[model samples]
Target: PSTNKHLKNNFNSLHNQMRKMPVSHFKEALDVPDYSGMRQSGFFAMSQGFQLNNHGYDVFIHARRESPQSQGKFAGDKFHISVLRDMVPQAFQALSGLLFSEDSPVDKWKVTDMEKVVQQARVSLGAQFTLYIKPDQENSQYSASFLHKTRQFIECLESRLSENGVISGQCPESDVHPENWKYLSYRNELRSGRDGGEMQRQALREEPFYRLMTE
Candidate 1:
């Protein structure tokens, strides 16, 4: 399913803000993927399948696990969902610096060169709630952004794994793939699309967290 109306509005506002920001700032904002077609991607594909199967109720319950009350339960009362909220803008700032830097690896991707303005209309938005039984309340709901941190964490992990030879390089005969040369070759054929896809997807997914505030 598409993001809710409120989220769609918020994303549009932030996306516009990023576009008007300085070139450096805009570059920083470009690191995230465009989420406009998130429903088409496999990330939320489960929801689509659930809806088709008439299991929408279960999908809603799964999302509720991230609610504020539930957040405290899963993320801890002191966990501070704001940490992620705060990290997003900072991450964008860092990304901006990388974009303009002579050493930036962004040049490898043609998407970065195309100047595609990342917009919030393309972002995917969802909330999660954790069930908590506190001394004062029976249950409360806490919501947090899953897109930014999840992608950042995944990138970091992938980077680490790449360094450790767990995931071979994108190219064939690059000292990583010995069993699936054909797979690696096919992947390389689509490497350009992969980079563009990653760029758009990351920006759309991560931009929302930049403005997230806890309730």
Candidate 2:
């Protein structure tokens, strides 16, 4: 029997194409991917899935296990869930629109050249939860105009999320962890002398894969 292909792979191929679209074109052709059959792995792994209430969401506070380097110990070895650590930019944008936008109930989310933060979000039973995304200024960057629009989008979205009583599990301060240090080092080494801002500017200037009939 021909079974369904893995959703992650399917989503990845679709994402690759989606990211190249202009904001105007993307807002016209956006679909939120289903989060079923997806499990956390790699650097941002979680101990288990989740147990959500009827509201379809819940807070996960003090959930992650301590670093393996901590005096040969593992903390929070018990069951817990965490914000997803990775997501395609287009997916994040669409999902944020679903949860935050007031005017566009079903169709609309701008895709811009904002810096991609590792996926940070609250726990949810399904694909319905808030994210803790932000710019990674040092490694990846964006054009000034794109950055301005990103800030405005996030601020408005955050206000809506905050009013809905969602508490993002942002750490009080940067935790001294090997994973973070390693990640930062890796990114720096990879992009030693490149200009992420200029790259973003060029990308923004590109035409959409599909154009409006009138254009």
Candidate 3:
């Protein structure tokens, strides 16, 4: 029975792990920003940010700028990590739908549409984030070294998340659907079923999401 707390904590841990991967891996392996490159609008590469479009796995990069922090002459000597609201909300949606939608407050939560839940959730959150790393010693922010190790690190984290149930539905390794939704009569939307679906959908209108989309 995975709760939001579990999902949140796991992702939080993933964040810290990402921060430590090689700077080269940030771009070369983990898809981080490249300041030197520019788009047609002329913004630095990755400075525009990114979002998983959910279309044939076509991720889009756009919006957001938090500036770069440099500690010395080493190029891209900064830490850049921004959340994709599109992704954050979607991640929640996916987690709840795949692992929590149920008949009871706890069991169904132990967690949705069986197949519909998995497919829908997979196609949905497609949300993702980009992590940029560089050599910034003074501020105590630096990139990981040993490309071979970092590459495996990124792959393992992604595989672990997908297996844990934030599935990509693209090349899924598990057919293991959410546990049984035991409570059939009393369904809490926040916990499972139709009402649950509505709440998750309405999450898009939440203040944080609204802010991310508009400004």
Candidate 4:
């Protein structure tokens, strides 16, 4: 059997249950792998499952657990969901089109509980998946640029998921693997005593590392 419909029915049951609640957080992230499997090399691969610049979402495979009473009713029996926020600030731009600091945060950035922002389903579709995404709804909670990436994170999920999603285990050992090409030397970090800004300068120099900007 496909096990596909088996997955979908419980998925909806969980979603409907969530909708009835006063607030919602977390969402159905499709076939993301085991929690421990994200040990992939670069930061991008951890969130995106590929060697690219989409920057990561801090969502875990089973990030926020369903309540014990509801667990039996949710998707896949073992599946889980996430709200896409890092519980800490993680990325800047949502896509490749943004420019230097255009997506970066300034001092004006403020933080929110994320749970408060979990308003409703921003992205939902037939049966494959859904995201009850939460952005900086207040706009002041994050820089507009910083806040924009949350939607883009969901966008990345759709774009790559339409194709075969990467294994996440299939990423480089070093940041760039055999090429060893990205600027920041993970080995060099503790030794050089480099200024944080200098480190940020090196990080921003590479295609895969635009998310690594420092100051």
Candidate 5:
């Protein structure tokens, strides 16, 4: 009936799908740090609740580093793909091309802002993948392929770095279980009409929990 709770349930369903879905559209995607690596502050979080903020259309990506001493926090590059309400239909078409076809419609996208909150001669992808959405700022509808492309891009860089010895880490075993409760807490807060600010802060207290949980 489109009640508030119903909408919450619907969002939860979509959230689950994005976090738990299998990758059939792409060959390579970013992988979250293993369970133990994620224990303290390596769990990854992705949000699908932005649809409530901007009338159902938004896309973006954020990456940062977690210092060993400052607990866990660093700022860096940001890539955003936003579609305003009036431009939903046309924007989706462009986004589809960017994801499915080998088309990088860079002309359609622009780097509207750049903040050098971080810098280093040589760095690492320490943040892994913290896919976030502003709880009530812009409601953005996301499809499976958006993350599909995101994964492809991240892994592409990952392989290049590992190949050259720029980064190194052991892969998690096949029997290890994933952590999903962190994401669940975030979803519950969103479902209750709260900003999830506290939850966000808690999750990031050490670093971006970049562990991807799948079922």
Candidate 6:
């Protein structure tokens, strides 16, 4: 059941939903780049198998810049949502090992300490909606308003799911733990003009039973 085929299908379905309502608020959500004239970098899907070290899996949706003038400057965005099947401490420990391994490319990012990354990732991934607004006169104000709106949207979504029995019990705390995997839904915010500017927010829920685990 861990075949790449299943992963592809799952990612495809998620992508379909994403494309349906591509934009949330004008400048508060992920930007849909113009695909008309650009030489696009075809979508590539990465599954758990590709995760050489870390647990769970990721599928990156990105595009390579098409302009000749923009050579060497690849402009694309990625959305990666992972589910850790292990408990909190163990999962963080494992993440630390993988992230610190010389074999891991992320290690080159200078995030030398595993615990720091784990803490940062946990908090960064604990939100429903994230926005990437242009830095203008109202940029800060817009961000605050967007955060409030996002919180409201998530609350409404949770309430509906609870009423329908789609989600059980109260929302989980933001602390890092294996159980946190069950409640995993993350959306990335890629600002238009901000280079290397991206943020992720996670959904609050328990890890579904389908996640792979071994005794």
Query: Clashes per prediction?
Result: 29, 0, 8, 1, 21, 9
**Model 6 C-alpha lDDT per residue in residues 137-184, reported as the tens digit of each score:** 122111222223333333333343334333222122322123433333
Scored by lDDT, model 4 comes in at 0.24
lDDT tens digits, residue span 1-215, model 1: 11323334566554444444332211222332232222232233222112111123222212111122112222111100011222323322332233222322121111110112233111111011111111112232212223222223223322333343332222312111123121111111212232335444334333233233110
**All models: lDDT?**
0.24, 0.24, 0.26, 0.24, 0.26, 0.24
Please tell me which predicted candidate would have the highest TM-score against the true structure.
5
Sliding window of 10 residues with minimal summed lDDT for model 1? 74-83
Better of 2 and 5 by TM-score: 5
List candidate 6 segments past 4 Å from native: 1-144, 168-215
lDDT value, residue 26 of candidate 1:
18
Tens digits of lDDT, candidate 5, 1-215: 22233223455454455666554333221233222222212134322110111111122122222211112111121222222223323332323222222221111121111121144111111122122321111233233344334344434333434343332222111111124211111122223222325544444232221221122
lDDT for model 6 = 0.24
In model 6, the Cα lDDT at residue 14 comes to: 34
Give per-residue lDDT, candidate 2, residue 32: 24
lDDT of 4 by residue, 56-97 (tens): 342221112121111112111110112133311221122111
Q: What does the lDDT read for residue 125 in candidate 6?
A: 35
